[PDB]
């Protein structure tokens, strides 16, 4: 981060949604189609997983933006799955609405006045109206003259309740959503799904639907409707079903019952007024990630392609098998008898491939890890690379004790005093001490190792002589010869001095006083951090080979915190009990018994 390069906008919020297939054909750089990654002489073949349209790859310019490896951000493409296949993230929630729905009138199997009772309770819970949603049960074989009238009284009660609370300074039209209205929303949807799944007959038109059997993942089975209740299908006047048929059912269910699932699939009020669709549970197009994020595993000559390329190759191999299986249906009884039993076998394996790409444990098959398992645990993405990160400008070495250090300092070696550096922008008051810092060079303490120009350019002092280096010291405080950079000044990456600040840190950091801020005082001899004995009670740090970290902050906002706020003089009292943790330890306590004795004259 450059303090002289501000940034204008800020992410204020995020929200979660599902890529529809129309977006990821417009978003896309190039549809990739053949399951060969790169051909002979190491070139990425056009249309493969490595393509120049999906990013610059291995000293070869991108075909989309025309930039090299260092400046291409990487571009997304897509593949065309021929059959709409299951998204394994949403299969447990698809299978609830796959069940609990009538296969004849395409409502749910509840009565339509009780499904409406949740649509008007969940609309109230989108706004901050947790109280009025229990007053709505107070609005209370049976003819449809009054059930049409009961739905009007429940809906006009909500339209009166929402309009009053939005005028009585309580709820914005973006809706009030707190933690305890998330309680009664998750409680009410779990009441809704548990009551949908427990139905015998559709309570709108009274006849049964054949039940469904979830074998595991990748498959779905409708069970045999019994002989006792096919009579009800005749007085109204087992089989692996396809994934194309499940989408055909649920596109019809979500239109007959759109007015309920706007409030089941939205926590806050739907201001965009978009439909919720059953295509959003399936996936008809896989998004291949950019080739920056799936570079091959390079280790000398042992070049292996990435684990995602090995999973996406099997999806493309199956997608061209099924294209060559549907080329026989255009040719057309035995030629139809065997070609369909292998086509339905190819329906399962392309689902079994889109499982293994997303989730390696929902894939029947030591297995190659999926997209889910690059995120989950320790060594995931959240815990390993977001909540914890490797850092620049930070040191670690063994500690040796040191008195004659003023108890708010750390004793830094010369070898960390030369490598660790700090950007001072030049002013009228630095050109005394920071002109001598640049002249001393990268190896003399106190010195400097780099000059950042006004232009963002960066000049290294490593391969330079002292006569060239005195020329850059007089060029250091000069007015700008560019209008667009007239208010900027040069930054000299000086070495760490006796005035800087340092975070010291020993693992485990079981409490906050195990990571304090020390001043620095360089020492001229050896390669170890040097700590005073009053700090050993807080870090829990003996000297039998302890090494402890050293972080060096890189701006004035963090220098002001590690001197005033996370300072080691502020941490005399721990906040556990209020008892102190800092104090002299072993030789200083046995000396004070002898020094303060009556015998000591």
């Amino acid at each position: 981060m450059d303090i002289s390069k501000p940034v204008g906008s800020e992410i204020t919020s995020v929200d979660f949604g599902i890529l529809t297939a129309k977006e990821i054909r417009n978003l896309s750089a190039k549809q990739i189609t053949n399951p060969t990654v790169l051909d002979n002489l190491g070139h990425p073949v056009s249309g493969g997983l490595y393509d120049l349209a999906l990013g610059a790859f291995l000293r070869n310019l991108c075909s989309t933006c025309g930039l090299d490896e260092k400046f291409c951000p990487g571009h997304q493409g897509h593949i065309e799955l021929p059959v709409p296949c299951y998204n394994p993230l949403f299969f447990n929630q698809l299978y609830i609405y796959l069940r609990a729905s009538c296969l004849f009138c395409h409502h749910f199997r509840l009565k339509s006045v009780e499904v409406h009772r949740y649509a008007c309770k969940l609309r109230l819970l989108q706004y901050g109206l947790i109280d009025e949603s229990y007053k709505l049960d107070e609005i209370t074989d049976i003819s449809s003259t009054l059930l049409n009238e009961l739905k009007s009284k429940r809906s006009e009660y909500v339209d009166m309740a929402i309009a009053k609370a939005l005028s009585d300074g309580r709820t914005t039209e973006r809706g009030s959503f707190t933690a305890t209205v998330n309680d009664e929303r998750k409680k009410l949807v779990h009441e809704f799904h548990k009551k949908l799944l427990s139905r015998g007959k559709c309570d709108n038109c009274g006849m049964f639907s054949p039940k469904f059997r979830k074998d595991g993942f990748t498959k779905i089975f409708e069970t045999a409707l019994n002989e006792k209740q096919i009579t009800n299908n005749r007085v109204k006047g087992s089989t692996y079903i396809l994934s194309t048929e499940v989408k055909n059912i649920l596109d019809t269910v979500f239109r007959k019952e759109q007015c309920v699932l706007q409030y089941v699939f939205h926590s806050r009020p739907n201001l965009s007024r978009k439909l919720v669709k059953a295509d959003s549970f399936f996936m008809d197009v896989l998004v291949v990630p950019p080739t920056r994020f799936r570079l091959p595993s390079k280790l000398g000559e042992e070049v292996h392609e990435n684990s995602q390329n090995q999973l996406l190759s099997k999806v493309l191999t199956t997608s061209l098998l099924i294209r060559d299986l549907n080329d026989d249906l255009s040719k057309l009884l035995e030629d139809r008898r065997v070609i369909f039993s292998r086509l339905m076998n190819a329906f399962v394996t392309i689902q079994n491939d889109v499982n293994a790409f997303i989730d390696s444990t929902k894939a029947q098959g030591v297995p190659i890890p999926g997209v889910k398992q690059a995120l989950e645990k320790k060594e995931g993405l959240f815990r390993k690379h977001m909540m914890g990160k490797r850092v620049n400008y930070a040191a670690r070495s063994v500690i040796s004790p040191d008195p004659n250090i003023e108890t708010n300092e750390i004793g830094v070696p010369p070898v960390f005093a030369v490598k660790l550096t700090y950007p001072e922008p030049v002013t009228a008051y630095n050109i005394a001490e920071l002109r001598q810092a640049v002249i001393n060079g990268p190896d003399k303490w106190p010195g400097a190792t780099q000059i950042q120009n006004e232009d963002g350019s960066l000049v290294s002092l490593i391969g330079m002589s002292v006569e060239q280096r005195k020329a850059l010291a007089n060029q250091l405080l000069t007015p700008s010869s560019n209008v667009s950079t007239h208010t900027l000044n040069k930054k000299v990456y000086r070495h760490i001095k006796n005035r800087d600040v340092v975070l010291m840190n020993r693992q485990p950091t079981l409490h906050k006083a195990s990571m304090m801020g020390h001043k620095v005082r360089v020492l001229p001899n050896e390669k170890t951090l040097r700590l005073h004995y009053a700090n050993t009670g807080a870090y829990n740090a003996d000297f039998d080979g302890d090494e402890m970290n050293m972080h060096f902050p890189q701006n004035e906002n963090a220098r002001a915190e590690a001197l005033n706020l996370a300072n080691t003089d502020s941490q005399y009292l721990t906040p556990t009990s209020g008892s102190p943790v800092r104090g002299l330890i072993q030789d200083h306590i046995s000396a004070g018994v002898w020094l303060t004795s009556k015998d000591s004259f």
């Binding site: 995020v14 979660f16 993230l89 939205h266 806050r268």
Partner: protein, 47 residues
């Protein structure tokens, strides 16, 4: 259980205002506790 809270967040279409310190480190905000619990304004002298 990341991709069980991920599915529940996307099936709610849940917007989050980036309030927790965990949510501000993922997206890269200043933390809302301590020093980042206020803004700093500058009194410029002229209109």
């Amino acid at each position: 259980t990341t991709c069980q809270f991920l599915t529940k967040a996307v099936l709610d279409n849940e917007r989050e205002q980036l309030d927790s310190p965990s949510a501000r480190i993922v997206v890269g905000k200043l933390n809302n506790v301590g020093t980042g619990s206020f803004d700093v304004l500058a009194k410029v002298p002229n209109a």
